[PDB]
Design a protein around this ligand. Sequence first.
Ligand SMILES: Nc1ncnc2c1ncn2[C@@H]1O[C@H](COP(=O)(O)OP(=O)(O)O)[C@@H](O)[C@H]1O
Lengths: 496, 62
Amino acid sequence: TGEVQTLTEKIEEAGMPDHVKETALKELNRYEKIPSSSAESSVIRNYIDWLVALPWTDETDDKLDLKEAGRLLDEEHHGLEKVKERILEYLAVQKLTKSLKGPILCLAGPPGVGKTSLAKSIAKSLGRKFVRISLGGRIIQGMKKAGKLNPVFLLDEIDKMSAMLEVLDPEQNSSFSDHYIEETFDLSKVLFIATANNLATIPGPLRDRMEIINIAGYTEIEKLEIVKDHLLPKQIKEHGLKKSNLQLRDQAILDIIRYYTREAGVRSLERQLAAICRKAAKAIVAEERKRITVTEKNLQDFIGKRIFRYGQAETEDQVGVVTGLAYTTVGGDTLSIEVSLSPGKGKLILTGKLGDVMRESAQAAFSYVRSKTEELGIEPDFHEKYDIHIHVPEGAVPKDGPAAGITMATALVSALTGRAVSREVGMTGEITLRGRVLPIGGLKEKALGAHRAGLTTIIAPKDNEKDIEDIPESVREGLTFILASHLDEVLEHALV
Amino acid sequence: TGEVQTLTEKIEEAGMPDHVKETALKELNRYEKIPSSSAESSVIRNYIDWLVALPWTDETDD
Ligand SMILES: Nc1ncnc2c1ncn2[C@@H]1O[C@H](COP(=O)(O)OP(=O)(O)O)[C@@H](O)[C@H]1O
């Protein structure tokens, strides 16, 4: 007998068609079964098995019926309207170009917005098998975990990396190599997708090889529905218990959000739900009560006390301290800029991010007040006998650095003139020497997160109005957008 | 058997005509297959492959 058949037999099997390989197959095969399992006989010994699973003939039979798909996406993700409209473009386009083409997409946005799920769901539609392949530190494995050569790899994180191009280059990806198994391989039909946050760390080389889609975040309205029609039931069912077991009134869901999550995604939101799904269950087993109704009053009796600040209830207006909306790798954020006055020379030293990008802007809001002075109410003998300190908290992403111009400006003035920025207002805008207010980046996400922390007024660049169009209904409805072109306009509205 | 042929074989192949090179070829080749893949045996190990693809005969007709 001998295991000279256990393998060989299943080798000539229907599986393993291509002969270009079978050569290298029986080759290292008819090798040295002579002798026993020497230190040598353990080596190539295994080389054969990895080789047994790798698909060739196998493959999936794609179904591409948009009428579905597009509205299976609406079964497993709430909003993301625009983001879907673009997943289908990537399919209606697919159908025609019968062979998947180079541009493979990255999903980008704060974590907890659905990137990973969208993928799984892209694939559910295409009826291809799905594989996560984490790149926090090897496709080798990939196929194995799916023994069907028409998959959906999700290069999850390409940006927590310390070059691989080869694997995606439309020209090359066809013929694929890999050490410790050296042999070409065809990846023609392999839907690739990428997750990502800080689009930086991604290698310029790659970012061009790939087409990008931004998932944005969510309006209170959106989150709320996400909770009700997906999040909750999922967690109920997962903590094994009945829909008739536990219900949360809308208002409380809102509260959970406003007061226990300041995220753009809904991860924190899911966790706090589960919190309750849990608490709930222990009742259902002990007390046995077939129902548990968490309300806007109950809330504390489940998830603890309040966790974040919303609105202006707590806050009082301050001096030389403005609240600028900034574009963090993880959504709209509310970094506050401060300025301090100490005797000295016209020199101005700033803290926080070392920022060489900032100084330019800073010493411009600065070089503004230099001019229009008495006109503004401030002792002209100042840049001569004061020393100004500015703090610009880190978070704003490179492109958006200069978007803090009107902010530092506003502060520096409110600081010099003992006035006071209105705690309610969040601002963003680029400054110029003359006092001009130039166009700013991603107003959408900015006002989205400006609403999240519950501000009223949000001063931004005049030349940005055509950007307010796409700002989701719910939030554009709770904000009064003061648009401005020169500092004085900003200053008048943001100071009191 | 040993991989003492997997490479060598395709080396004397029709590909690799010029002898000015084949010297340096079998030279670092008949090297130290002794011993196993030591920290050393990984070095020149590869030097041979880059050398396998290089063109010589293949003169595309213009
Ligand atoms: N719009 C959404 N609708 C439903 N679930 C969502 C949505 N966004 C996030 N989720 C939750 O997250 C999953 C997909 O996103 P997730 O993987 O959590 O964040 P990320 O996409 O950044 O990894 C969903 O299964 C659900 O848990």
